Amino acid sequence: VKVIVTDMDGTFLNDAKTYNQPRFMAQYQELKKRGIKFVVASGNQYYQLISFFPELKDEISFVAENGALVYEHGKQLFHGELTRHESRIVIGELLKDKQLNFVACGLQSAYVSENAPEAFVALMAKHYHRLKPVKDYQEIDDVLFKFSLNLPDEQIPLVIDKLHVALDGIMKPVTSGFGFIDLIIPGLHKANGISRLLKRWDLSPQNVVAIGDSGNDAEMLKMARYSFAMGNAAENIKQIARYATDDNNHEGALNVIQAVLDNTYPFN
């Protein structure tokens, strides 16, 4: 074990969006001491992610925007991007649904129509700390690499079919991790993001512990030697992961970490 990667919503975070800081801080100290790395792999924005680790932000690494942005020890390592035409197309397609609310996620900030329901903005504000109102999604001066849709992830099968033809796979629908849908560049998932750090560190999946609970954690869990499904994880995630742990309201993620430090089952 050389790397521990964790999801946030429904994983490392309890339902109230908090975690045992004193406990994780002591653990992290032991992980650092042992040379084991800590990575947060999440669909959330880099800026909201670091808000949860204000004291460790420059030490640990992040795989943000579901794989679109990767920071290694404080430095930006990679970021995907849609071509100007690809984004115009996706945005044009989304705007055809004059009932749909969505967020355009960029390298510098996320963006949302200034004509979006107050309730939608508040929810998105909890996943994107840099959220700017705009008049025209087409006039955004930033590189874009992901979208977040105001639609329950329950409708994913439907979104796949609708966008299959309309976008021909310019982007694929996956769960945001907090009940909604994210449109990502195919291939730019958490596993792909984590792979960039492993290459950088010269480590392999064989040394990776990964913890998750929803659909967007699929390839991350399948990739890792030590894959953990949260007690509250979805069915297909529980199946994919080799191991299990308590739910997010009972420090499931931290128990996996503990097991690593004390060498309890799978580590022994």
Q: Which of 6, 10, 193, 227 binds Mg ion (CB under 5 A)?
A: 10
- Please report where in the chains the tokens 């991790």 appear, as a residue: 177
**Residues touching Mg ion: how many (CB under 5 A)?**
7
In the complex, least distance from residue 17 CB atom to Mg ion, rounded to whole angstroms: 11
Is 80 a binding residue for Mg ion by CB under 5 A? The answer is no
- Please report where in the chains the tokens 């925007």 appear, as a residue: 65
Q: Which residue lies nearer to Mg ion by CB, 113 or 227?
A: 227
Is 214 a binding residue for Mg ion by CB under 5 A? The answer is yes
In the complex, least distance from residue 248 CB atom to Mg ion, rounded to whole angstroms: 8
**In whole angstroms, how far apart are CA 126 and each of 21, 89, 119, 193, 247?**
19, 27, 11, 22, 21
* 141 catalytic residue (yes or no): no
* Sign of the dihedral through C-alpha 250, 254, 258, 264: positive
Query: What part of residues 162-191 is at the interface with Mg ion (CB under 5 A)?
Result: 177
DSSP readout, 151-188? EEGGGHHHHHHHHHHHTTTSSEEEE-SSSEEEEE-TT-
Q: Which residue lies nearer to Mg ion by CB, 137 or 228?
A: 228
Residue from 198, 201, 192 nearest 65 by CA:
192
Residues recognised as catalytic: 7
What are the residues binding Mg ion (CB under 5 A)? 7, 9-11, 177, 213-214
**Binding-site annotation, residues for Mg(2+):** 7, 9, 213-214
